[model samples]
Target: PLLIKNGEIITADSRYKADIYAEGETITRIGQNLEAPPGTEVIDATGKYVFPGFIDPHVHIYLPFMATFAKDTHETGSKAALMGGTTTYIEMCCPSRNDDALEGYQLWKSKAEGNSYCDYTFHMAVSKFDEKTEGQLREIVADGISSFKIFLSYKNFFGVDDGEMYQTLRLAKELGVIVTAHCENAELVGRLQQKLLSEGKTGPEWHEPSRPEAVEAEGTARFATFLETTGATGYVVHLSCKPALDAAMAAKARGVPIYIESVIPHFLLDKTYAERGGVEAMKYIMSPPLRDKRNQKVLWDALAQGFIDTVGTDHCPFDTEQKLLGKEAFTAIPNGIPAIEDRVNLLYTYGVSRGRLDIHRFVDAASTKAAKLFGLFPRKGTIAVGSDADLVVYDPQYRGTISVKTQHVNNDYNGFEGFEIDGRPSVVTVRGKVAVRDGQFVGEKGWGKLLRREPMYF
Candidate 1:
């Protein structure tokens, strides 16, 4: 038995603390001044805030074809996520047209089930449009996997055409399920990237500028319009520019139910770091490449003002060698960087520590809200009765520099290397089980539970 005392417990749906009681893996009760048995373990968390473990709504970990396996898989990604205070992650399962989505999901699930040190959920990426694929969408949703994702920028790869994309969205909408899309104007960006490369402006620094803010704006506008046109709702995966946010805001105001999610690296770092990393930054290169500095303010503003709905990691890892392929020109580099372990820390240090976010608001954006939106609400995202005791004891007064030396991701390097933060979740727990304590990991692989998530409304 354990008694966490003197802590400011922030329930996912509430704005303040209510002392929490834990018996085993579930929160047994929530009230004031709850007493524990005399022999129980006790932790005095006075002055420290207790937040529900954060939820990362979007990430790519087990996708097999990314970067030829330079590094990173679900096993390593999930471990890093938990230590960072993001206990529940919703990752996309890439199921091909020629293969069974359910089968592929089971394979991916088996890889992490009972092997992860944290809790997790899966969002089946709808890559195929055949009858079998469509059937699996509904069948899998029934099996506790509710969200479906489709890419609009992977081009001929995972990117689905507008027609297929709409079909998927319509199906999900009809079924009262959710859809998330990567909104990048691939056709326009691709052509511009080619033109820039032909003109000798090919480099990691130029990659995002080539794609430009307008391209992403166009994609966001289109995605919002598509959501309206299809008479359904969808989520924009990673908004990096104001124009996109503007469009999303308009749709949201119109009651179109368009939700958007952003990532930490994009929120904290910018395209300016491209110089230090070289084309090496291409390793950090994601589709909606880091936008201009002003856009960072736009995103942070949205988050602050409640315009942005959720924050995720998009935790794709690629090494320097493989990232070099894109350096020969701007077209060959792998997209995304590894930052699952740094999400909550950055929010705490920059958002709350800096006084930009209220304590309750910060916890909600980083964790609780995501669980609610992604259908894992009241289960894995809170410190309340009936919720998994996924908790973090954060000391907000400490500050430190981050380096690759302490990074646990399997990637050869971290894009956020050399970063610093003031507040960090020093101790992490999962399902009433303490997996990390005092800056050390006690949870090991094969210790995580498979989370079958239900459909979320709104």
Candidate 2:
């Protein structure tokens, strides 16, 4: 049992001060002036913003990217997540086209089982949808995974054909699951890469031109059309650029069950970082590359206006050496940067603190909505009785600067370098047990529980 007192509680729809009490693994009581039982440990959360433990709906702890794998293990990655106040992370469990679906799920599970401090789950990727693969996806859903991931790029690696994409959506609808997609035209990007390299445009600056906004918009339209035809609930992941968003929103206007997500980098960073064109610039090279600064306010307004369902970090960590592997060309510069430990902080610094978002919207974007859309609601997202006691005591007055030098993530560089954050998670708890204290991992590994989310599809 644990007691958290003197904290101002913020949720997606409300805010107030409460003295919270947790017994065992769930929050049993929340009220003012609550007394702790004898022998219970008390956490004096005085003057902090107490919110639900944030959930990063998108991350990659054990990712196979480019020609190599990402740098973080679940052990390292979960600690990074917790240090940033994320209590759980949903990883994209991607398999090769030839791999067995269940085997890929198991391997992804094996890496995290008994090894992490924060909770975890997965969005089982649909690499190929043959008859054999279809049956395995059903079993994976039965194992508590409620979402399916599909990529429209990566060509032979992660991309699927039109037939497979349609079939995957149809199957997901039948199984009552939501399909999450990476929207981009694979063939267009494939050809553009070759075209650029041939023209001697081999720098990181060329990464965006190879797969520009128009391609993403086209792919988003295609994905929306497939979802419309198949009648499946859909979520667009890491949606960048105004055109891609307009495409998705255009479908929404016509009655598509579409939910959209925006990542931290897309909301803050712009194309010029990659245009810097060097080892440092390589860090900004990700799929659907950072857009122009003009697109930032659109995303911010979309989030504030409730057009975006959730905010996440497509947290794929590749170190400096791994980035240099693409020294010959920008095409192989991995595809993501480390930001798992910075999503909550940056979201607060740029969105809430600057008044682009209120605290309710902030909580919704960072924590509550992710839990609701991903089937962990009430249990993990809000402050209420009987919920999992995953809570974050955020110290609002504590100002800090973010750098890879101080982060817990196992990476050599941070994408949001020198970004000043307005607050830090003073204490982050998983099921009422403190896992992080003063923005550092203070809990032991093997404390993580693999959450099995039910399919609460629309």
Candidate 3:
């Protein structure tokens, strides 16, 4: 049993001082000065905030991409995520076209089942939509994958054609699953990449040009149209700019059911880093690359206004050494940034403390909405009775600088290195077990349980 006292409990709609009690792996009660059973572990949260565990709706774990695998395995990534107050993460189980959905699910399952430190689940990506692939996907979903992922980019690897997209959506509608899309016009991006290289503009700076705002806008508009036509619910993953948001909004206005998410980095960083030429710029090379600084306001404003549904960290980290693979050409660099450890704190310091967002909105974007979207709700995203006791004791005055040397993520570079933050988690618990305390990880590897979820409606 566990007890957390003297804290300001922040919820999706209210904030109040209370004590929370958990018996075994579930929260049993919440009130003022709750008594604990003898031998119960107690946490003092005076002057701190108590929030439901955050969830990352978009993450890539055990990922093999751009000719190499992501540096952190499930072991390291989950630990980093927990330290950042994220107790549950939904990883994209992406596979090559040649792999079967069931085979891909098994492969990813083997990787995370006994190696992770936080609760986990996968978003099955539809690599192709042939009859065989479709049947395999149905079996994968029946085995507990409630959400599906399909890409409009990475043509030969993970991208699906318009027919595939339509077919996948139709299946989602039939099976009551939510489909998330990696929106970007693949053909336009490929042509632009070739054109830029042919014109001698091969630096990382050109990566964004190859996948400009238009690429995302066009793809989002297409996704909206398809969702409207098929009458299936969908989500647009990593929505980065105004044009994409506008398209999503237009779709919603037209009665298309869709949700949108943005990564922490996209809302905080911009394309200037990619423009910084040489090795330094390679760090920022990600698909649908960072946009102009002006777009930051648009993203933040959308988040504050509830136009955006959730905040996720693409959380795909390739070490600096691996990033050098694309030094000569941006196309060769494996795309991703490390934020599995800094996302929650950054959101608090920048969004909450800065008044761009209130504490309730922060909880929604970081945890609640994600839980509801991915079907991990009451169990993982709230501090209510009968909910899993996944919680974070946050100290709003714990100011510090985010640095690579002191972080838990296995990557060599910090995506938000040296960025100052006003607060951080003082203690983190998973399923009523203390995994992180005072900036240290104490949980056992392989302690994480695989989560089985069903589709959820908003």
Candidate 4:
């Protein structure tokens, strides 16, 4: 048994001081000044902010893109995620257009089953819709993967045609599954990319132009249209820029069921980082590329006001060497900014500590909403009597700079290097046991449980 004393417990709806008792992976009791039984491990967290463990609904640890594999294996990525207070995350299980859906899900699950240190689940990627694939899709769904991932843009890589999208959404509605999508117009972006290369514009800056705000807005509108027509629940992933946000909002006002997610890099960083050129610029090159400085306010205000449903890191760790492959063409840049280890820290520093958000909203956007949408709910999202004791004892006054030297991820180069954050987790726990102490990972590998979630579709 483990007991935490005198910490301020903050959930999506309320905050107060309480002592929490945990046994066998769940919060057994919660009260003020609780008594601990014999031989109980006690952590005095007086003056600390005790929050339910953070959950990122999006991340890609073992990714395959840009003709290469990603750097962070679940081995290091899971430790890094927990070290930053995240006890649960959902990855996108993408299968090629040729791979069978059931087999693909198994392959991805096999990679994480006994290798991850923080609990996780996956979003079954529906890259192709056909007779055989549909049957496998049904099986994967029956296996408890409630959410499906669809890409409107990867062209031949991950994109499915409009006919396929229609069927996918129809099937999702029928089977009571929600589709989470990456929205961008594939043909339009590919065409622009070709034109940029022909005109000799090959910098990372050109990456944004190829799939500008207009293209994303169109995709957002298209996704909403498809959802409306099919009557399926949908969520837009890594949504950046106001145009796209407005498109999704318009759809929302029209009574279409859809949720929008904005990533951390979009809220905290800007397009200037991509203009720096060469390897530095390559680091900032992600799909739905970083927007102008003005959108920083756009995203934060939306997140704070509850317009944005959740904030994910989209934490794909690609090393400098991996990014450099795009030196010849911006199109080849492995897309993503590695920050699973920094999402909660940066958000707390700039959002909560700076008054852009209340502590309650922080909890909602970062954890609760994702849990509700993706089916992880009371089990992993909040601090409750029956919830998993994935608790974060945060030292509110701890001042620290984000540096790769102190980060626990396996990849080189942190996109947020040299940035200062206001607070950090002094202690992080997974399933009633201490996993990270003073920002150091001490938990055993493969201790993570693979959460099989039910469908929360409407």
Candidate 2: stretches off by over 4 Å: none
Q: Per-residue lDDT for 264 in model 2?
A: 92
User: How many clashes does the backbone of model 4 have?
Assistant: 0
Model 3 scores a TM of 0.98
Against the true structure, candidate 4 has what lDDT? 0.90
Q: Rate the local accuracy (lDDT) of all candidates.
A: 0.76, 0.90, 0.89, 0.90
lDDT of 1 by residue, 1-458 (tens): 55667777765456455566687777787777787767665666677777788888887777654447536666787778877878888877876554677798878777676667777888778876766767777888888887888776656666677788778878887777778877777688778887898899877877787677787777777878877887666888888888878888888998887888888877887777664556556766776888767887788878987788788888887777878877577677777788788888888777777747766677778887778777787786667678888888887776887767888788778777777888777777787777777777878676677677767542
**Model 3 misplacement above 4 A:** none
Q: Please, what are the lDDT tens digits per residue for candidate 3 over residues 1-458?
A: 99999999998876899899997899999998677899999999999999999999988878887568998889889999988889999999988787877888999999998898989999999988887977888788888889999899987778899999999999898888999999998788888888998998878899988999988999999998998898789999999998988999999787899999999999889999999887788898887799999899999999998889999999889888898898887889899998888999999999999757978999999999988887888798887999999999999889899999888888889988899999998889999999989868898788789898886532
**Cα distance off (Å), candidate 2, residue 31:** 1.3
Report, for all candidates in order, the number of backbone clashes.
5, 0, 0, 0
| TM-score against truth, every candidate | 0.93, 0.98, 0.98, 0.98
User: Which window of ten consecutive residues has the lowest lDDT sum in model 2?
Assistant: 436-445
> What residue runs in model 1 are displaced by over 4 Å at the alpha carbon?
12-19, 31-39, 65-67, 96-100, 275-279
Q: Model 2, clash count?
A: 0
lDDT at 160, model 4 = 86
Q: What 10-residue stretch in candidate 1 is worst by lDDT?
A: 63-72
Report the lDDT tens digits of candidate 2 across residue range 155-187: 998899999999999889988899999999999
Clashing pairs in 2: none
* Residue 290 miss distance in model 1 (angstroms): 0.5
